[PDB]
Symmetry: D2
Subunit: 325 residues, 4 copies
């Protein structure tokens, strides 16, 4: 009768433990085990039959592509089992959007995959982790949650991995998608589903990574007044396969950036022009080098580019991925 949910722990402030109730820096993110998290919210056991698995225990600023690859592989294994109805992944907030979007493109199942995180450590006064986890378990176990793509659940909100981003350095309500909104919200112990994303993901995605053991190198370069050509030269010299440009406005580029991007393209590096602004569409512009990010922000664009480079070097195909995923 209860759903079977695996809580797969990777680390984060959600598993952080500090010396006092108001310590906000200098505590170890990813100190507490997945069973400690579970045991602090015994209410979870009335929503699902939960099993904890300790995948890693790191702060998400140290999450790396090779590890995210393994996480995606393990989640694909789990969801292929009949005794697993969904998976909740505990993660740090800083790079959750990157990890979640990676799994959104690579998990070949319609069963729910819900990332959860906490802006305050577990020891903190008014810690948000307990309720965030409870909400994430509720979402992962609900039959209505299937086929929605990978989700990110904090602060009563259910965000699509493709749209959601950490918008604020430090607040509980940081995760928002200003232009695209939330997939749903959790209020009064009930899920209210609002939207389905109109993009390819999960079971309809071409991005299979089950045979892979590493990913193509992609760096992100910022756009600003006086931005230097030499950062493009260094990226090329170090063997990047892609550069994502966090551009000025709508992916616009200085004379120096144009020179860098042209040098990159000459050396077989794919350039995606995204925006530093935080939101909105980078439109095509045939007068400029590179491809355009559609509404993907720089961190998301890097994840799609990395995966696109496992399949193709055809700029028409990559550009179409950015308009469809």
């Amino acid at each position: 009768k209860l759903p079977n949910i695996v809580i797969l722990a990777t680390g984060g402030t959600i598993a952080g433990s500090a010396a006092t109730g108001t310590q906000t820096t200098g505590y170890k993110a990813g100190a507490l085990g997945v069973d400690t998290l579970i045991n602090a919210v015994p209410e979870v056991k009335k929503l699902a039959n939960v099993k904890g698995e300790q995948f890693s225990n790191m702060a998400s600023q140290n999450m790396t592509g090779d590890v995210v690859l393994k996480l995606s592989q393990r989640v694909n294994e789990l969801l292929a089992r009949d005794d697993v109805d969904g998976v909740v992944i505990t993660h740090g907030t800083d790079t959750v959007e990157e990890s979640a979007y990676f799994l959104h493109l690579t998990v070949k199942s319609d069963k729910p995959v819900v990332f959860v995180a906490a802006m305050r450590p577990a020891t903190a006064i008014s810690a948000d982790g307990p309720m965030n986890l409870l909400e994430a378990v509720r979402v992962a176990g609900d039959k209505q949650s299937r086929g929605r793509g990978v989700m990110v659940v904090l602060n009563d909100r259910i965000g699509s991995a493709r749209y959601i981003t950490k918008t604020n350095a430090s607040t509980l309500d940081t995760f928002k998608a200003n232009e695209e909104g939330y997939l749903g919200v959790i209020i009064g112990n009930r899920i209210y589903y609002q939207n389905r994303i109109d993009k390819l993901h999960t079971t309809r995605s071409v991005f299979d990574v089950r045979g892979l053991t590493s990913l193509p190198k992609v760096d992100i370069l910022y756009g600003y007044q006086d931005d230097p050509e030499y950062l493009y030269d260094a990226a090329i010299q170090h063997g990047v396969k892609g550069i994502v440009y966090a551009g000025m406005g709508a992916g616009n580029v200085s004379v120096r950036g144009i020179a860098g991007m042209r040098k990159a393209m000459e050396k077989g590096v794919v350039v995606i022009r995204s925006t530093r602004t935080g939101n909105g569409i980078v439109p095509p512009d045939e007068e400029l080098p590179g491809l355009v990010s559609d509404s993907l922000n720089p961190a998301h664009a890097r994840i799609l580019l990395m995966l696109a480079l496992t399949r193709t070097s055809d700029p028409k195909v990559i550009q179409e991925y950015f308009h469809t995923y």
Copy 2:
């Protein structure tokens, strides 16, 4: 009886001219002269006695610190004159926030300095430039506008240079300060002032650049999964005096970024940890390298750092600037 306003033109989509009413890319930003702008909104002449001056005519993605320095010097000259009551600066949207914040720190006058820009070119259907300019002139000529710091006026809103940022690649309403709001709004031909910024600026600022002819080099490095050490090495090798880090979450840093920042500090480079998120406070953390950006986003933080480096290398002094400016 009318205020005397100088319209000082630098370029931008506000002075853009395209082949049709819906062409959104591949037109020259900064094609039209300041007198063409003025002549399209003759209504401006009922609000002020206006004089146009063509300072530059470039797209703002190509605006550089050396030029912004000269702009600040020229605006300081103008505002010292009794026949100038305020100045409106037409600029591209992409880097307006950078130029405006520079002048906010360096213009030693309480007379209004209002940057204005347009998201659609002058030729576009429903072009926003005409009304934005009219509003900017109204603001610059109003006696109530004095002593407010440098302002950015688009879409009926008056933003402080210290808070306002381009939040969306492509929309008319892009300029917002999500946490700090607008200084005021212009509705029905009337200015409604809401807030005064609680920060140092203009006449209370230490940042004098009247004797300067160049600025210290500062680059911006992004924070993301797998971010590389080699970009810090390249920046150091190329003689940066500062690095602003657009960090993961609240200026958090990977093992690789920490190694880079430590190398930079060892070579006499000041590091400021800002955030890629778009909003909010990077708090102090003595366990991490560098100084923290307070609520300055990466583009603003670069401008303050550059100016701070003209005066000092004392990290206590620079850190205090970031909490006060």
Copy 3:
């Protein structure tokens, strides 16, 4: 080869004509004919074969349910024709959300129905109507726009009738759905679809009004400190069939409001508890009188209640409508 679009005009500031370019009040909304609108944006004729029809010419604050009923009936007639591919409805901004939501529930077609409006009159400097109309025609004629429910298009954004609301009295960017986002955006002459609404509408809706000639009376009462019982007594005395309560917080009710709501229910009036806050979920609460609005704001809740009352008085059925529509 071009789509066939009917532009059905009802009035609004989009068809407003004032004496000068900055007159913001005291002009007649709905002065200009639909052919004048069309002739100001001849670009529309490259996107569709357009035909204008003058349905009404009023300011939307004077739009009434009886007229909205007829509008829905006429749109159902039009969309049943093979020579009509979609319909764009020009309307005032003040009550567009009400009219649009009514049609969202009652138009039995998957062909696009796009409401469009303008915050500045047609004569205004930087009038937004021309571009809003062009965007609305583009949306209505696109094959990808089918089956999305009724849409509201201003300022480069495509809002669902069920979520979108006028959030600001006076700004061009007023239409937003803070929690649910936009269905899509129009940038660079291209439509970017983001979301499909996860609610019943149009072809899946039970709300048929083709045989009807009037609608049940529903009033809206506000919630605030010292709110009076006597307004409930007056509404009952005047024969309301429903009351929507724009409640304090999450539909919460004073001792006086509870007395009023109980009196209403005793006299056969259905009460829906909504919120004055502007956003979010009113959860069920069996300790309080009436039904709950889910995330419907007061204006939308009134439209659903009115339609629900044409079909049923069963509070279980009405409550389920509020969770599904």
Copy 4:
């Protein structure tokens, strides 16, 4: 050395106590005493010397003007004492904005007055009250907090009573001022002040209520399609002295509402046209009846109108209050 702070308790979900950790409705708001609140966050005693006083213990939907009057009188008494450095007022979230704005206009002291509330009850998993109270005490005890007007503190944010409103029925981040932002934020145990409000308040306000024992009656009427004249007739018949109209768009009014407003003005009732939209400016319009609310939302506008009516019936004076307070 520590500041002396009085915690003056009125009730609310902050003092709510439910049977389980996830019960969201049907619990008594204002069950717990002020000493229970204090004893749950002993950390408060390291920030201030605190004394609790139980002013009332009600749910804020039942807060009434007569009681808010007494609260303002008591806070004025407290702040006149040398042994009180500031006051924190615990209150329900639903009408906090009304009570806080009343005190903003009537407390004749520059010492901090900080309202605090909680969206989750004290018993709830991840209850927000403890941290909100700690933050409110920090704000009230800080010397930099003086002369800022009355503040509302939840979720790491410090809102001005004049701008802040509950924007969402049910979320922790509900309190926002979309156009005006926050006065400050509290992150990492530190206050970051961003703005000072550019409006009259507290020590510069004319609104003295120290001799008063009751307030003029003011009701709020909503604006919508088919809005009825009879609600104006009932309000007049019941002796209102003011009506605030939560208007369609920018305070716009139907033919029926105009008839009602004219009848009200004929009987000596002052009408203020506000907006139901949630934000922005209602501009003057001499073609319409009544005065305009500037950017005051309906709940705030009622509080100012009530106080304005204790002093004057001169519409020029009242209109100027709405532009200055």
